[PDB]
Amino acid sequence: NSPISPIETVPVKLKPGMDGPKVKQWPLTEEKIKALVEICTEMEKEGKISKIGPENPYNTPVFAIKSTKWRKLVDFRELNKRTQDFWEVQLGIPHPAGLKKKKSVTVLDVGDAYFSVPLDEDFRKYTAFTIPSINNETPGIRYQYNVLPQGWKGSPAIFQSSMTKILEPFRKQNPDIVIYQYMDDLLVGSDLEIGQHRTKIEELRQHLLRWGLTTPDKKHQKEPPFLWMGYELHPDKWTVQPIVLPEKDSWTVNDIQKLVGKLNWASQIYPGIKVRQLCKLLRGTKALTEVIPLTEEAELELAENREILKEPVHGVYYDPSKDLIAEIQKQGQGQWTYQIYQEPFKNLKTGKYARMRGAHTNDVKQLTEAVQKITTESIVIWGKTPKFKLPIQKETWETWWTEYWQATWIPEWEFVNTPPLVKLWYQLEKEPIVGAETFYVDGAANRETKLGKAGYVTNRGRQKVVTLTDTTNQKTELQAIYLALQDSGLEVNIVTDSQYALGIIQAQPDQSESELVNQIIEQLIKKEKVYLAWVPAHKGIGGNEQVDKLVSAGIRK
Amino acid sequence: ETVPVKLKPGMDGPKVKQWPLTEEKIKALVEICTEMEKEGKISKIGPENPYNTPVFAIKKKDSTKWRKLVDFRELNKRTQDFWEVQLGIPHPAGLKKKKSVTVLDVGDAYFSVPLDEDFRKYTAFTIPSINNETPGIRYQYNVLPQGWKGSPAIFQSSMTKILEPFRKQNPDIVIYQYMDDLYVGSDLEIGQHRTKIEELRQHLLRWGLTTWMGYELHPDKWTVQPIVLPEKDSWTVNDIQKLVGKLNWASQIYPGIKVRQLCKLLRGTKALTEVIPLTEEAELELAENREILKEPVHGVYYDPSKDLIAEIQKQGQGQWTYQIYQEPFKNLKTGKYARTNDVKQLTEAVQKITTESIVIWGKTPKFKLPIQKETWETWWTEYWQATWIPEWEFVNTPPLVKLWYQ
Ligand SMILES: N#Cc1cc(Cl)cc(Oc2c(Br)ccc(CNC(=O)c3[nH]c(N)nc3Cl)c2F)c1
Ligand SMILES: [Mg+2]
Ligand SMILES: [Mg+2]
Ligand SMILES: [Mg+2]
Numbered sequence: 001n002s003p004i005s006p007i008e009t010v011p012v013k014l015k016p017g018m019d020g021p022k023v024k025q026w027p028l029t030e031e032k033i034k035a036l037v038e039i040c041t042e043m044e045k046e047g048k049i050s051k052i053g054p055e056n057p058y059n060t061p062v063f064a065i066k067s068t069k070w071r072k073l074v075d076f077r078e079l080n081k082r083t084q085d086f087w088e089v090q091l092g093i094p095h096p097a098g099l100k101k102k103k104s105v106t107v108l109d110v111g112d113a114y115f116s117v118p119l120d121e122d123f124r125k126y127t128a129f130t131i132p133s134i135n136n137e138t139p140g141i142r143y144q145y146n147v148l149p150q151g152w153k154g155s156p157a158i159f160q161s162s163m164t165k166i167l168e169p170f171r172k173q174n175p176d177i178v179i180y181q182y183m184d185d186l187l188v189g190s191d192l193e194i195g196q197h198r199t200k201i202e203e204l205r206q207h208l209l210r211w212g213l214t215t216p217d218k219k220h221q222k223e224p225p226f227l228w229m230g231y232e233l234h235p236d237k238w239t240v241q242p243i244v245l246p247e248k249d250s251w252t253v254n255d256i257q258k259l260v261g262k263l264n265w266a267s268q269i270y271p272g273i274k275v276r277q278l279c280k281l282l283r284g285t286k287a288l289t290e291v292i293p294l295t296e297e298a299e300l301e302l303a304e305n306r307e308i309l310k311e312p313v314h315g316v317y318y319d320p321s322k323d324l325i326a327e328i329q330k331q332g333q334g335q336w337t338y339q340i341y342q343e344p345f346k347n348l349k350t351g352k353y354a355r356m357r358g359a360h361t362n363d364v365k366q367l368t369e370a371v372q373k374i375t376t377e378s379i380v381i382w383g384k385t386p387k388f389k390l391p392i393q394k395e396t397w398e399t400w401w402t403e404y405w406q407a408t409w410i411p412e413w414e415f416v417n418t419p420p421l422v423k424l425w426y427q428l429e430k431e432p433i434v435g436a437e438t439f440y441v442d443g444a445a446n447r448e449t450k451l452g453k454a455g456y457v458t459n460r461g462r463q464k465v466v467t468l469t470d471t472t473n474q475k476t477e478l479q480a481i482y483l484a485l486q487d488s489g490l491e492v493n494i495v496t497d498s499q500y501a502l503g504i505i506q507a508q509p510d511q512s513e514s515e516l517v518n519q520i521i522e523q524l525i526k527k528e529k530v531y532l533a534w535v536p537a538h539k540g541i542g543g544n545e546q547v548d549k550l551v552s553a554g555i556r557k
Numbered sequence: 558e559t560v561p562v563k564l565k566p567g568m569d570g571p572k573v574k575q576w577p578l579t580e581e582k583i584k585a586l587v588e589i590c591t592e593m594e595k596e597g598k599i600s601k602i603g604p605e606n607p608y609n610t611p612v613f614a615i616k617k618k619d620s621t622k623w624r625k626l627v628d629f630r631e632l633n634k635r636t637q638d639f640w641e642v643q644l645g646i647p648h649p650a651g652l653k654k655k656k657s658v659t660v661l662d663v664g665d666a667y668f669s670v671p672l673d674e675d676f677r678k679y680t681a682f683t684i685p686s687i688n689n690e691t692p693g694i695r696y697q698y699n700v701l702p703q704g705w706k707g708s709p710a711i712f713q714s715s716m717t718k719i720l721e722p723f724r725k726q727n728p729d730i731v732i733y734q735y736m737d738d739l740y741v742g743s744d745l746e747i748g749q750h751r752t753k754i755e756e757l758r759q760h761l762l763r764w765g766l767t768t769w770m771g772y773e774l775h776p777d778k779w780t781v782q783p784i785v786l787p788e789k790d791s792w793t794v795n796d797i798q799k800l801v802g803k804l805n806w807a808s809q810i811y812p813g814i815k816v817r818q819l820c821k822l823l824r825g826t827k828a829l830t831e832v833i834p835l836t837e838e839a840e841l842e843l844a845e846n847r848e849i850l851k852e853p854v855h856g857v858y859y860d861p862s863k864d865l866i867a868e869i870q871k872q873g874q875g876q877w878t879y880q881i882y883q884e885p886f887k888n889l890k891t892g893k894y895a896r897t898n899d900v901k902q903l904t905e906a907v908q909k910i911t912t913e914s915i916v917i918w919g920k921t922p923k924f925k926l927p928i929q930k931e932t933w934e935t936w937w938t939e940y941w942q943a944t945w946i947p948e949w950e951f952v953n954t955p956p957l958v959k960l961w962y963q
Contacts, residue, residue: 010603085607091575091689098688157604164692180690372931376577379935383580383687405871405959407899407928409936432795432829440826459828493829495798503955533829534957535798536805539816542794542823 002112003212004047004147007166009120010158013084020058020126021078027136028064035070036062036131040143048115049143050124056142058128076151079126086157094180096231096238097268097340097349098381101317102178102189104197105233107222108205108215110163113184114148114155116212117162127152166211170204179204186215230265237314239269245306254288256281263305269315270308271350272337277301316346324348324386326374330363330420333511336370340378340386351377360509360517363422364400367392371410388413392422400424404507425510426524429531436491436529437462439484440543443476443498444551453551454479456487457543465550476551477501478516485523485530492530497537497544505532559673560711564635570608570679571631575693576934578685582614585623586684589614590696598668599696606697608681613938617662626938628946629704632679636707644710648919652731655742657750658774658916661758664737664944666716666766667701667708680705703737703944719764723757732757735915737944747773769894769905769942776916782878782891784810784850784961786843795829797822799960804846806961810886813849818842857887865889865922867910867947870959871899877906878962881914881922890917893963903928904940911947923948 014020028036043049063073110116119127127149130140148155163181171179177200180187188204190197198218205215226233230241243266248255260275260282267273277297286292294302319342328338336353339345353370367390375385390413401408432438438459445452445468454476455465464483468476477498484494496502504517505524512518524530535541537548564570578586593599611628633640652658672680680698701708709716713734720732730753731742741757743750750773758768784807789796801816801823808814818839827833835843863883870878875897881890890913894906903926911921926933930951 010605012605084605087604087607087609087695089692091685091693094688094690098690154604160692161604178690181692369929369931372929372935375935376931379577379579381688383578383583385579401899402873405927405955406953407871407903407926407932409898409900409932432793434830438827438829457826459826461826495829499956506955531829533795533798534802536802539801539805540820540824541798541801543826546826 001046002214003116003209005117005162005166005212007117007162007211009118010154010161012120012123012154012158014082014126015084018082021060021082022057023059023061023075023078025059025061025130025132025140028132030134032064033131033134035064035066036072037141039064039070039072040131040141044143048147049145052125052128052142052144054139054142056125056128056144058126060127060129062129062131074129074149074151076149076153080151080153082126083153086154089156089160090182092380093229094182095268095349095381096233097315097318099233099238099317100178100320101236103191104194105187105189105224105226105235106197106201107226108186108188108201108208110184110186110208111214111216113159113163114150116214117148117159119145119147119149163213166208166213170207174200234314237316239312239314240266242312243309245302245309250291251294252289252291253282253286256292257288266309267352268349269347270313271339271347272308272331273305273352274301274331274335275352276332276335276354315349316342318342318348318382320382324378324382324384325389326378326386327389327416327418328367328370328374328391329418330367330391330422334366336366338370338374340374349381356513359514360504360507360512362424362508362510364392364396364424365507367422368408368410371413375411385411387411389416390414390422391416391418391420396423424508425521426527426530427508428506429529432493432531432533433491433529436493436531437488438493438495438543439488440495440547441477441480441484442496442544442547442551443473443478443480444548444555445471445473445476446555451555452476452479453553453555454483455547455551456480456484457547457550459543462487463547463550474498474500475516478504478514478520480547480551481505482516482520482523485520485527488527490526490528492527494530494532495535495543496532497535499534502532502534559671562636562639562673562676562707564679565638568635571610571629571635572607573609573611573628573631575609575611575683575685576613578613580687582623582938583684583687585614586612586625587694589623589625590684590694594696596668598700599698602678602681602695602697606678606681606695608679610680610682612682612684613941615938615941618942624944625703626941626944626946627682627702627704629702629706630946630948633706635679636705640706640710644707644713646709646713646734646919648735649731649733652733652740652742653776653917655731656744656775656777657747658740658742658776659750659754659772660770660774660912661739661741661754661761661768662737662944663716663734663739663761663766664703666712666761666764667703667737669765670701670712670715672698672700672702704946706736709734709736715764719760719766723760727753733919735919735945740916742776769909770912774912774916776913779892779913781853782893782963785963786847786850791832792835793829794823794827794831794833797833798829800843802957803961806957807846807850810888811849811854814846815842854888857889859883859889859918861918865914865918865920866925867914867922868925868954868958869903869906869910869927870954870962871903871927872959872963875902876963877902878959879906879910880962881910891962900928900932900936901940903933904937907947907949908941908943911943911945921945921947923950925950925952927952927954 060079061075064070124144127145130142132140178189208215232239232241243262260278263273263275281292322342324340326340331337334354339347339350341347353373378386393415439456441456443454450470452468452471453465457463478501481501535544613626614623615626617624677697680702683693683695685693733740801819804814804816822833860883865881867881872878877894879892880888882888914922924947926949
């Protein structure tokens with residue numbers, strides 16, 4: 001016997017061309033028929049459903065399951081396929097680090113959200129269902145919904161929307177009060193003295209009650225800390241709910257996935273959490289019950305994480321009258337960690353970034369991407385970008401951005417001497433090196449056999465050719481460059497016709513998915529001077545024509 | 558009456574996500590929309606509307622007041638039959654030949670014409686909140702909106718009545734409407750041109766319409782950016798190798814380009830720093846090549862049924878090169894933009910190139926932008942000043958394509 005809201009209905013349609021559902025009712029046991037008859041009778045008294053007849057041709061199946069308490073289950077799959085699309089409710093969830101501290105906060109959960117909002121009258125006919133007769137002998141008892149049903153595609157959206165309209169006048173009345181709407185919950189914060197706040201909560205409840213929406217009284221409302229979506233929300237801090245990292249001699253994939261999920265969740269406030277090595281154990285074909293022995297690295301990473309977690313850490317709330325400061329540290333091969341604070345060193349939140357963009361990259365590019373990721377996240381959480389502190393010298397950043405072919409722009413930042421610092425590990429000469437040997441390199445792979453050759457000729461009369469199996473044209477062009485690097489002294493000029501190889505090497509990579517690129521990088525760092533130049537293939541260009549003929553022998557023409 | 562509008566058969570309306578907005582811009586948008594709602598231009602909508610188009614706030618060129626910019630790119634694609642085929646505004650070939658073209662914003666014209674009731678739902682947009690605190694604020698248009706190519710299509714008949722006296726009294730002035738703007742070209746001395754533009758402003762004013770580039774455009778000034786070849790008192794192997802490479806790729810665009818003679822100089826396995834004297838044959842081959850590159854490309858024509866593509870290269874020192882084509886190497890236009898960070902400069906180049914395209918062909922190109930998608934999307938609105946938005950995608954061309962255009 002709960003209120004049905006006198007809010008206006010949202011008009012609702014079937015998808016164009018589609019008619020309503022007509023799914024036959026399967027016979028039910030007497031026990032289930034009886035349970036359903038009394039549930040429906042009671043719901044009809046409350047105005048939630050109404051009885052109809054066989055004039056209405058639509059139907060959706062109904063079921064009951066049991067405990068002593070019986071529940072009615074309506075299977076709206078078919079109606080749902082035929083119902084229009086709606087606007088999605090939540091485009092994201094509030095992050096606690098985004099909340100501004102209030103003197104007093106109350107959570108009001110709306111009791112039976114959906115059943116108190118009325119369904120558009122023109123749409124009710126499509127919600128028809130039938131309690132069957134015993135052994136389907138006579139016609140069933142037929143009903144239709146008057147309110148938003150459980151499991152129907154439009155209920156979530158039409159509820160939030162109804163709740164929005166109902167709150168609007170109260171908001172204008174009470175502009176100082178914040179009210180967040182998340183699913184069934186209203187989250188209500190004020191900076192009033194605690195008595196005047198308890199009063200305003202009472203007004204809100206009455207306002208909601210006047211619109212047919214019931215809520216719990218003061219004696220029944222949750223007290224802080226609030227547990228909510230895997231977070232703890234206290235009066236002056238917030239954290240993630242406690243993380244139990246299970247101990248175990250043996251680890252199933254299922255256990256490792258669950259561990260990784262927990263560590264990922266912990267990383268938004270515990271700084272320095274790492275999951276790289278634990279994630280390496282999950283790549284590959286893997287049933288959920290198959291045991292995976294932890295590698296040395298995964299054990300080290302786990303022990304390190306356990307240390308970070310042993311003492312609890314909490315974050316602070318947001319103060320809009322102050323800048324956000326974001327710091328980023330390099331943690332290792334491909335791993336970055338960050339903290340955002342307003343007053344050093346009281347973090348609002350933390351996080352990690354470890355993403356391979358492209359097959360080959362360097363630390364300057366990775367830091368830029370990390371900055372870009374933190375920038376977007378800040379706009380979402382706080383509505384503004386933070387000022388950055390980055391372990392890269394202004395001169396290193398300048399050199400890189402002005403020479404690089406892509407547009408890049410880090411917003412306001414400062415250098416901070418928190419090693420390891422981000423640098424470039426080698427550079428290419430802009431000019432040919434006098435007094436250094438010139439290597440003309442090339443590679444060729446056969447498409448059928450997958451055999452290939454890589455090699456060089458040099459202006460000093462040297463030549464070499466190595467033979468390769470199960471290779472590709474790309475691989476042989478990089479093998480050729482690798483050869484010239486191993487056989488050359490500390491200064492060398494290298495001429496290639498591979499735009500592919502050139503492009504990779506000119507971006508000054510320090511890390512790569514390719515073993516071969518890593519070996520080239522390793523060599524490039526040991527040299528004092530390297531000049532790398534490109535020429536087009538098959539133009540009879542001096543040194544190139546001869547390495548070409550050499551590596552093409554037995555492979556191509 | 559309202560002019561009925563249909564979608565592309567089996568096309569549904571746009572469902573595009575709102576990119577995140579700073580607080581400052583959210584607040585600006587809330588103020589703008591509250592006012593537009595009171596004037597009846599937009600109305601709040603319920604959840605039974607599943608459509609969305611993104612919105613942004615920008616500053617016009619000199620002004621410091623916020624302006625709402627709706628991204629109707631998706632809606633424009635989905636209503637192409639309506640605005641291109643059914644109600645197409647023909648583009649004058651003569652505009653690009655005028656000494657001066659002035660660009661006047663006439664977007665306010667549209668807010669006085671009601672939008673067809675059955676179409677309004679496809680114009681839905683959302684003002685988001687910070688930290689997903691509150692649900693975003695949802696509206697649709699009741700009137701022809703700015704940024705929809707359907708709007709000048711429908712207002713066409715009215716624009717003609719408004720402009721009739723002025724066109725009749727000034728038969729050699731060319732006036733072209735594209736999206737929310739008027740392009741007005743004359744061959745007058747600039748004083749008289751500006752005088753006539755002020756006259757035109759007075760006509761528009763009687764119809765309730767108040768009012769990377771200079772004041773005016775000068776499209777008779779625009780001219781080819783040639784591929785240029787270096788000139789040197791002496792040539793190394795490395796230098797020649799570089800020139801052969803640059804000519805090799807130029808030969809894909811320009812026929813007749815020859816390298817045999819230059820390649821004959823490089824025979825053997827030579828040191829890169831070794832100086833090579835040019836033989837007479839090689840000299841004249843370079844002279845012939847140099848002459849070819851001065852003249853334009855035979856056989857390349859605009860095709861109105863194909864999309865325009867624009868490629869842009871970062872050249873360093875605040876310089877950017879670009880090419881517009883429809884089939885690759887069939888360059889319709891090449892240029893250079895010069896002279897403040899990379900993203901700012903890049904948005905300036907994009908707007909300048911789009912404007913030129915509108916003037917020359919009545920179409921915007923699809924841009925291939927040399928930048929991280931996320932960086933672009935975060936920052937582009939900080940510097941954007943146009944009321945239209947071209948299509949773009951993101952590329953990374955590490956080649957010597959940069960070295961070849963300057
Ligand atoms: N459950 C829950 C919940 C979830 C969210 Cl995302 C917000 C919420 O309400 C809050 C609001 Br409304 C505003 C600020 C905060 C942060 N906490 C406080 O300010 C606060 N003050 C007091 N006295 N207790 C708490 Cl907790 C709030 F927590 C409550
Ligand atoms: Mg080759
Ligand atoms: Mg090859
Ligand atoms: Mg070759």
